[PDB]
């Protein structure tokens, strides 16, 4: 459906366009996975926010309302004289953190939805401007957005996420419902570090597969048809 | 001059409208001799062809056949919802005459 | 030589500008013989054609007709905002002569 | 007329189906004289050609050869899953007759 | 053989480089008789055409004129940054000879 | 028949491989008379052309030249990684004979 999510960020629209979207820490470009990135939801969710709204460990956070995003924004970014609130379509790269982490969600009050690998430009509906903590309530539309594609999609269900929860290898969660039914090999199950390596490889495989879907939706329309008979 | 696919399909004998309101499930393309054609299916199993060019086609249709193959390929890739197809049903698979995309 | 669609449209008889500032709502395409054409609509109900190539057209327009159908297809699929259309008003639906995209 | 790639492929001698269900790993294209062709590989190492046009081809295949190279290029760039290929096995690498994309 | 657009432009009389380093603001295309052309603008108001094919053009340029309209349409729709145009400045608006894209 | 770009390039005396494993930095296209060509650069300054069609080309190569310019344009816009180029090295810039794309 056409629901939107919201994120406060000091990186301005031109940086977003150049990066191909809203990126997790340490990634300069969406589709370019030439650099190392740890992907782990639990670590993402328990990370501290020091002048950046949570974007570590391979995910990028959103709020479920504009009010909530604005509140978050005042808390973290009040030292900036300008920042942006990005309005974001729902799609299956988004996970409801409370639902996936359950009772172990570290900040349940925040009601976070987090995007694995960050948010591609095409998924960004638009952006508001915030000046000196004051929300300017004009919405600037992104020409790159695709409404029919994204309005036909929703966030990922929690059961697509349980296996990516990223709890420590011997955490009680891996032996409790629901996570027990989705535990990566080595997690609550003779080379060291299997759980960590499988958590990471399942994340990388998810993002590979997701990026394939984005490439298909966007790059398809770069196809220029040729007059085959003339040629 | 028709203003929509239903009125256009009504001008021709041996046609019918199929209402799909769905994206294309599969796209098949062939360059084999005497089978230079495309075939699409939908998730319910409904199958449609773009016919091999032949004596049933006037010269002005040759370029439109090529255009239709282009349209189905990019519709498949972009997952565009197909609203309706106008087909001839004196062929199997039913043969595409026109396509509409909305929503 | 004109510098914009309005001035170009003013050089022809039986033509007018429509200002849509909106994406295309539907795209229809036909390969049926003598109806090799495309039809677009907008959510306000306005309907437009790219005409079948015919004796009214000169040679230089043949390639341009094919290009215009290609442009409407990709405009529909990428949800690009159509600014204006220059159309002939002596056809029903009105027949596209030019398109401008902005914003 | 066949309803699918498997049936189409059984109409011809010296052919077989390869089931890939995977995106293309590499795409190669050449304009070098007597080697105007394309080559694709999958991550499992399976390699396939679109043949150089020659006297084994009838005239109706010429346009279809060009379309297939367009299809493979965009499939590669979009990371679209290839379901099956129908190929001639009396050439090295196996020569593409038809492709299906699904899922 | 020039290595870049600036050196290419220097080989021709009545040409100049515009350095833009910006996306196209508007794209206009016409199929009207004797005006089969494209026009682009930038947000500073700079306006350019791809000319109607005519007697000033040699045969080898006719495919290249078609390619250039393809290129401008897709650059516009994908918001691609245009670095420079090479244009003939004995036409109004200035007529495109070459384009470079980069960031 | 070769199964990869390295083996294809080894079939010609005046060609060599370049390994890039990078996206294209810039794309330039010209319709100017006698310079109907494309030029690409990488961020390390490596520069390549698609040559103007000429008397060194056999008829079969003419359609492949046109295809290769389309390929470079979409590779540029998608930021696809170019793996290798096979080029004629008796020309300046080196002239593309083949391209391979892979991650
Ligand atoms: O069809 C267009 C218009 O409706 C007609 O009056 C004129 O004669 O030809 C136009 C096509 O170029
Ligand atoms: O020499 C010459 C070179 O340079 C090139 O052009 C080729 C193409 O094919 O040819 C010859 O070899
Ligand atoms: O039309 C332009 C170019 C295109 O080749 O040709 C020259 O002769 C003209 O001066 C210029 O306007
Ligand atoms: O039938 C002949 C050959 O035996 C095959 O290997 C292919 O080259 C086909 C192409 O139609 O032609
Ligand atoms: O991290 C060390 C622990 O690892 C678990 O896999 C094991 O069940 C425990 O008994 C303890 O050895
Ligand atoms: O123009 C195409 C159509 O031609 C008719 O003669 C035929 O009966 C239809 O099935 C369809 O092929
Ligand atoms: Na959605």
- Burial (CB count within 10 angstroms: exposed 0-12, middle 13-18, buried 19+), residue D45: exposed
A61 is written with which tokens? 């956070």
Nearest-angstrom CA–CA distance, B30 and D1: 12
Do the Cβ atoms of B63 and C36 come closer than 8 Å? Answer: yes
Nearest-angstrom CA–CA distance, B56 and B38: 17
Q: What is the strand order of the sheet A124-131 is part of?
A: A4-9, A82-89, A124-131, A134-141
CA distances (Å), origin A96, targets A108, A160, A179: 10, 11, 15
Ligand 2 lined by D33 (C-beta under 6 Å): yes
Nearest-angstrom CA–CA distance, E30 and A52: 49
E27 is written with which tokens? 């794209």
Specify whether the backbone of A150 is left (phi greater than 0), alpha (psi in -120 to 50) or beta.
alpha
CATH number of the domain that F79 lies in? 2.40.50.110
- Domains of chain A, by residue range, sit at 4-166
List, in order, residues 6 or more apart from A14 with CB less than 8 Å away.
none
DSSP structure class, residue F44: T
A221 touching chain E per CB within 8 A: yes
**Which of A123, A93, A116 minimizes the C-alpha distance to A4?**
A123
Number of domains in chain D: 1
D19 touching chain B per CB within 8 A: no
Q: Tokens 């905002």, residue?
A: C81
Experimental method, per PDB record: X-ray
Active-site residue among A112, A170, A177, A209?
A: A112
A106 is written with which tokens? 């570290």
Length of chain F: 103
D24 is written with which tokens? 């293309």
How many other β-carbons are positioned within 10 Å of the β-carbon of residue B89?
12
Q: Count Cα atoms within 13 angstroms, Cβ side, for C41.
A: 14
3-state secondary structure of F19: strand
Contacts of B1 in chain C (CB under 8 A): 49, 91-93
Instruction: Specify which residues D102 forms β-bridges with.
Output: B26
Give the nearest partner residue to A216 out of B66, B77, B80, using CB atoms.
Answer: B77
Nearest-angstrom CA–CA distance, D19 and A228: 29
Instruction: Specify which residues B40 forms β-bridges with.
Output: B27, B48
Counting CB pairs under 8 A, whether chains C and D reach 3 or more, is: no
CATH number for the region A4-166 comes to 3.90.210.10
Specify whether the backbone of D61 is left (phi greater than 0), alpha (psi in -120 to 50) or beta.
alpha
Helices (H), chain E: 5-10, 62-77
Q: Report resolution (Å) to 1 decimal.
A: 1.6
State which residues form the domain around D21: 1-103
């Amino acid at each position: 459906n056409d629901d939107k999510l919201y994120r406060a960020d000091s990186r301005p629209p031109d940086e977003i366009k150049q990066s191909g979207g809203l990126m997790p820490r340490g990634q300069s470009e969406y589709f370019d996975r030439g650099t190392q990135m740890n992907i782990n939801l639990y670590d993402h969710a328990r990370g501290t926010q020091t002048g950046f709204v949570r974007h570590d460990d391979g995910y990028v956070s959103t709020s479920i309302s504009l009010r909530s995003a604005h509140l978050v924004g005042q808390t973290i970014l009040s030292g900036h004289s300008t920042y942006y609130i990005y309005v974001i379509a729902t799609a299956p790269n988004m996970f409801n953190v409370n639902d996936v982490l359950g009772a172990y969600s570290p900040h349940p009050d925040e009601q976070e939805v987090s995007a694995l690998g960050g948010i591609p430009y095409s998924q960004i509906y638009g952006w508001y401007r915030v000046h000196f903590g004051v929300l300017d309530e004009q919405l600037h539309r992104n020409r790159g957005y695709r409404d029919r594609y994204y309005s036909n999609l929703d966030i990922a269900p929690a059961a697509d996420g349980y296996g990516l929860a990223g709890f420590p290898p011997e955490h009680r969660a891996w032996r409790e419902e629901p996570w027990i039914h989705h535990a990566p090999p080595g997690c609550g199950n003779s080379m060291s570090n299997t759980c960590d390596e499988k958590t990471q490889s399942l994340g990388v495989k998810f993002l590979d597969e997701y990026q394939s879907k984005v490439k298909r939706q966007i790059f398809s329309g770069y196809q220029s048809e040729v007059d085959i008979y003339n040629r | 001059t028709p203003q929509n696919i239903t009125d256009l399909c009504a001008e021709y004998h041996n046609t019918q409208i199929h209402t799909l309101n769905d994206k294309i499930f599969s796209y098949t393309e062939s360059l084999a001799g005497k089978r230079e054609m495309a075939i699409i299916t939908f998730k319910n199993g409904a199958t449609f062809q773009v016919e091999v060019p032949g004596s049933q086609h006037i010269d002005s249709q040759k370029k439109a056949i090529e255009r239709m193959k282009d349209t189905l390929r990019i519709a498949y890739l972009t997952e565009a919802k197909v609203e309706k197809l106008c087909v001839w049903n004196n062929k199997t698979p039913h043969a595409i005459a026109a396509i509409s995309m909305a929503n």
